[PDB]
Amino acid sequence: MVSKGEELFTGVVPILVELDGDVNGHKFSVSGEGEGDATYGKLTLKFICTTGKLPVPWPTLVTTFVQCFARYPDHMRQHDFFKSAMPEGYVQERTIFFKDDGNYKTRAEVKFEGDTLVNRIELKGIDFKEDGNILGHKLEYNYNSHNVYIMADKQKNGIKVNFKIRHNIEDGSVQLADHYQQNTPIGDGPVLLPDNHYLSYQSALSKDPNEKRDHMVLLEFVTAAGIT
Ligand SMILES: [Br-]
Ligand SMILES: [Br-]
Ligand SMILES: [Br-]
């Protein structure tokens, strides 16, 4: 049978993203809009820094900027925590450790407001080097493909997720960003607690040639795998 959570994603869903950030005291806000098509694991989003210039590189925020849009193969439907928490939603928390630099801590509430899927995020960054790769804007405007590893956390009625992002630095090297994540439902109802599996991501970053505000256009495809 098709669950209520699943049913909410069978078509194209509008997305709204709102982020308030503070990294080493540099405060900033970002809005984003677009749409998600979970049947195809497809996200199309555009983000605007509404406070002026973004004080960190856009690529460092890609992971923070709606895993309910992942394409789960039919045979893995019973492992889709994210959709099972809908419409009431889930809270996602991460710590992102930039190797040899600072860390971001994030908290996102992901839920429906009417027909719109909303990702409302608070991000706090501390201990960054003011001339490191982040605050010194040394990262390339591009993005690699990665796997994200998911396991159940029964004791929390949620999941634990971990993965490593490698950001290309302008000198040809790599800035590693080690991600630790937990998700917990907002409601009190049952969710799907998955067996171990992963999501496979590919991401493309671009610019809107008519946009004069500081911004990022993101095209992302996400597919669940690892159980067959
Ligand atoms: Br950038
Ligand atoms: Br998050
Ligand atoms: Br790219």
Swiss-Prot record:
Effect of V174A: In mut2.1; shifts fluorescence lifetime from 3.03 to 2.50 ns
Effect after changing N144I: In ECFP; leads to cyan fluorescence, folds faster and more efficiently at 37 degrees Celsius and has superior solubility and brightness
Mutation effect (A204K): Abolishes the tendency to dimerize and leads to monomeric fluorescent proteins
Effect of Y40N: In EBFP1.2; shifts the excitation and emission spectra to shorter wavelengths and increases quantum yields compared to BFP
GO biological process: bioluminescence; generation of precursor metabolites and energy
Gene3D superfamilies: Green fluorescent protein
Keywords: Chromophore, Luminescence, Photoprotein
Posttranslational modification: Contains a chromophore consisting of modified amino acid residues. Maturation of the chromophore requires nothing other than molecular oxygen.
Matches recorded under SUPFAM superfamilies: GFP-like
Outcome (variant: E220G): Suppresses the 399 nm excitation peak, leaving only the longer wavelength peak at 475 nm
Effect upon mutating A204V: In EBFP1.2; shifts the excitation and emission spectra to shorter wavelengths and increases quantum yields compared to BFP
Pfam families: GFP (PF01353)
Result, substituting V161A: In GFPB; leads to enhanced fluorescence at 37 degrees Celsius
Family: Belongs to the GFP family.
Protein name: Green fluorescent protein
UniProt organism field: Aequorea victoria
Gene name as annotated: GFP
